Ligand binder design. Structure first.
Ligand code: MG
Ligand code: MG
Ligand code: MG
Ligand code: MG
Ligand code: MG
Ligand code: MG
Ligand code: MG
Ligand code: MG
Ligand code: MG
Ligand code: MG
Ligand code: MG
Ligand code: MG
Ligand code: MG
Ligand code: MG
Ligand code: MG
Ligand code: MG
Ligand code: MG
Ligand code: ZN
Lengths: 116, 60, 127, 83, 152, 99
RNA sequence: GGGGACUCGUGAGAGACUGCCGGGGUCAACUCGGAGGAAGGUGGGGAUGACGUCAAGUCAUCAUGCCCCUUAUGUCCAGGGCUUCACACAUGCUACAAUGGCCGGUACAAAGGGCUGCGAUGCCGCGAGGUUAAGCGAAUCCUUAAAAGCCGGUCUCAGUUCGGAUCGGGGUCUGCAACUCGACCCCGUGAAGUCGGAGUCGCUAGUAAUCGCAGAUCAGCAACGCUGCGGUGAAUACGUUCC
């Protein structure tokens, strides 16, 4: 029972299980289930082949998921980098890009302490 | 404050968003109450002197 | 001339109309269970009328307001005690000994400048 | 100005300094201070000497810098790795 | 303090079980002012104990408390160039307080799912004399015994 | 009949009350229906400022500004009474409005 | 409509003084315990800082003695900076979950703000929001839905339906203007973190702990700061050896 990835964690309800798709969160999962017809309170174990085929087509009909979405994100980042903008410069330097504070924080953009 | 800045504030500036309030008595730019037009200092001395009707020390 | 009293606990005010009847609580159109579902509250109210007497008898309906549920419960307790004193003064010593006629002055202490709360202070941190 | 009811924002002095040249030729550097102007799909091929606080930097609007600002290609601060 | 003892506060009987023991229990479980939640947890634990043993829950609780209550504590002191433990008697109300604290503290860190069943299991094991709460009392007694020399 | 309304406001007690019941209550001899002064809840504007001119944040001082409101009376719009109402003048510390 | 009953609003008063009783004490101060009382020994809290100390802080609130500048160290303007970042410290917020997360229903506050303003209702939008517009300088209108709480359902101990950083895309509003450098909304992304070494902090009761609300500054930025307001509501104090 695979959509693109495995997406069949052992004994998960369908709305939560769908979030394991890279590109679907809770809201996307809720509208997927509402659109197809499968109820949220239903385990991924008890999913039929026809239910799977219904919810399969509808994700590439509308949404964007593993692979192409991951390509588009890095495409945007790379475009910013070689266009020569301020955000791209900060992407190259490995610094926060949305105007954060770098005096005492930014420990996610930077790694752990380097202890000069 | 400086008299040039006090005059500039009193005037009518370009881009009305630039208008800011200064203390009506001393010309302080910071901590100016709208209801009095005074800074916190000048407010404190005037209130103690009793020159501000209705204002008095507060205990509760 | 009905027996009307009042009781206050923190900021809640309860107006009681102690009245002869079967024994029943009406709390702006609700029963005692509807308004105060907590058993501790249900004991706190009608603790006074059972501390001596008596015991499930003539009913009450009272207006509620202000404070929180526990404060309203305490205010209702005080109002019931005051109403019982008014309607039958003989058991005044009993309720006074039980301590149900004290208004219980305990208000929220005001915040104080330079502190996080009424007493809580920021970390001292010598050096 | 950053809301889809008023369109993009360009300074009028910058617009009338580019639209009375692009109609005939790709004008050389336009010395300007208007970092806050967004690049519209008419600055293509032009070049701007944008102020950075101390000097003017030439920027060539090619194709993809059509939604950003003139200032984003004129860095103001200088940091070079304390050590 | 320095100016003698302070007045302690009184408690009222629990409505469903006419005891102050369960009132002290709910006040030990209470956190963040959630007294209704603490009462729910205690009531659920007592009901699970009753449904598992048949016996009256407050009687089971009294048995558990009698099992875990200590008699000698080990207050520390320093004399010269060394500090060593001094065994002293425990007064009854402090013993009850300490036993309740031990029960709740050790049930909070039991390997189960909900606090209701954690606390019920801890109470049953204590009443049987098996739990870590009983182990704590035994360790306290052993340490008070192995230091009788310093009973000045 | 139920037309004229008064709106006394003042910064201090001991002025608004007297300014009402010994100045506006001179219409009882004129023959006007008065319900008397009706005290409205007092207002409190508060301010908290730093005492020092520099750098001592933890030392502050509070100030109030109270407003007292009463006499919303419903005197009859008799033309001879309104004569006295408008020809009487009162302390400035008390503010009076006619509705 | 009406009523003066209840609350409340705001004015004037009463009340608490060891006043009364028992014991102690030079019969004195005073102390221990009772009675009556809403309250009992300073009822709780606030305002209130003696003589002085630290050549403590402020010449950047203001004032001011001497010194210094006067095509500049005065004054105007546009961009930039005050927001940097191998690190270090300090004060906080959010967490590491089941006394919990999410969903559905439902109850109970106080104190404040509002004409260059608050926008009820209706219509559009998933939402931030857009438009029309009743009423309201306000105990009468808006702010106003308090949240924890209670009931039910689900999740079943997992780096998770915990956590919400970072980043991608698309937007709303304020403002001449949102790149440097605004807040907020939607979709996606889902990091560290599984309770914290030596050490160290606050708190004795409506306190601590926890939950929301309001104001000032303010075009916007404060639901992490400050000043306040209420809701729920504990555990301990043997004692003065030690710090
Ligand atoms: Mg401004
Ligand atoms: Mg509080
Ligand atoms: Mg000095
Ligand atoms: Mg200095
Ligand atoms: Mg000066
Ligand atoms: Mg000077
Ligand atoms: Mg400038
Ligand atoms: Mg700064
Ligand atoms: Mg979550
Ligand atoms: Mg909910
Ligand atoms: Mg709608
Ligand atoms: Mg998660
Ligand atoms: Mg990890
Ligand atoms: Mg875990
Ligand atoms: Mg430690
Ligand atoms: Mg603001
Ligand atoms: Mg903070
Ligand atoms: Zn001033």
């Amino acid at each position: 029972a695979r959509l693109v990835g495995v997406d069949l964690p052992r004994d998960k309800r369908m709305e939560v299980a769908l979030t394991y798709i890279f590109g679907i969160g809770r809201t996307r999962s809720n509208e997927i289930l509402a659109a197809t017809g499968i109820d949220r309170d239903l385990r991924t174990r008890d999913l039929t082949e026809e239910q799977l085929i219904h919810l399969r087509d509808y994700i590439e009909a509308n949404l964007k998921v593993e692979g192409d979405l991951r390509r588009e994100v890095q495409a945007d980042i790379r475009r910013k980098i070689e266009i020569g903008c301020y955000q791209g410069l900060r992407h190259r330097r490995g610094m926060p890009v949305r105007g954060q504070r770098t005096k005492t924080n930014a420990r996610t953009r930077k790694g752990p302490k380097r202890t000069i | 404050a400086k008299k040039a800045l006090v005059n500039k504030a009193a005037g009518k500036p370009r881009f009305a968003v630039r208008a800011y309030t200064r203390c009506s008595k001393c010309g302080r730019p910071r901590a100016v109450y709208r209801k009095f037009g005074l800074c916190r200092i000048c407010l404190r001395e005037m209130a103690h002197a009793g020159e501000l009707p209705g204002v008095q020390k507060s205990s509760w | 001339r009905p027996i009307q009293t009042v009781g206050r606990r923190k900021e809640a005010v309860v107006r009681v109309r102690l009245v002869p009847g079967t024994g029943k609580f009406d709390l702006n159109g609700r029963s005692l269970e509807d308004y105060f579902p907590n058993k501790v509250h249900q004991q706190l109210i009608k603790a006074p009328l059972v501390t001596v007497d008596r015991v499930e008898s003539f009913d009450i309906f009272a207006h509620l307001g202000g404070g929180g549920p526990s404060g309203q419960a305490g205010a209702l307790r005080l109002g019931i005690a005051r109403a019982l004193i008014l309607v039958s003064p003989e058991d005044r010593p009993a309720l006074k000994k039980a301590g149900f006629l004290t208004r219980d002055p305990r208000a929220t202490e005001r915040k104080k400048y330079g502190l996080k709360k009424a007493r809580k202070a920021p970390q001292y941190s010598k050096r | 100005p950053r809301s889809l009811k008023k369109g993009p924002f360009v300074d009028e002095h910058l617009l009338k300094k580019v639209d009375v040249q692009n109609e005939k030729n790709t004008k050389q550097v336009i010395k300007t201070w208007s970092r806050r102007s967004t690049i519209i799909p008419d600055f293509i091929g032009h070049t701007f000497a944008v102020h950075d606080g101390r000097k003017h930097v030439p920027v060539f609007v090619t194709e993809s810098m059509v939604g950003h600002k003139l200032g984003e290609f004129a860095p103001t601060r200088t940091f070079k790795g304390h050590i | 303090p320095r100016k003698g003892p302070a007045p302690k506060r009184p408690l009222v009987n629990d409505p469903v079980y006419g005891s102050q023991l369960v009132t002290q229990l709910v006040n030990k479980v209470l956190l963040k002012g959630k007294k209704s939640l603490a009462e729910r947890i205690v009531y659920g634990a007592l009901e699970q104990a009753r449904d598992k043993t048949g016996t009256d829950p407050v009687i089971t609780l009294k048995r558990a408390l009698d099992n875990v209550k200590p008699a000698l504590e080990v207050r520390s002191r320093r004399v010269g160039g060394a500090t060593y433990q001094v065994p002293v008697e425990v007064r009854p109300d402090r013993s009850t307080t300490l036993a309740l604290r031990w029960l709740v503290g050790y049930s909070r860190q039991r390997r189960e799912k909900t606090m209701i069943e954690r606390l019920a299991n801890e109470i049953l094991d204590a009443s049987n004399g098996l739990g870590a709460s009983v182990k704590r009392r035994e360790d306290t007694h052993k340490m008070a015994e192995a230091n009788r020399a310093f009973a000045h | 009949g139920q037309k004229i309304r008064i709106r006394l406001k003042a910064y201090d007690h001991e002025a608004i009350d007297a300014s009402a019941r010994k100045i506006v209550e001179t219409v009882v001899r004129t023959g006007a229906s008065v319900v008397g002064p009706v005290p409205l809840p007092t207002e409190k504007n508060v301010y908290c400022v730093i005492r020092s001119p520099h750098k001592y944040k933890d030392s502050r001082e509070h100030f109030e500004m109270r407003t007292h409101k009463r006499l919303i009376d419903i005197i009859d719009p008799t033309p001879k009474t309104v004569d006295a109402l408008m020809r009487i003048d009162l302390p400035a510390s008390v503010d009076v409005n006619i509705q």
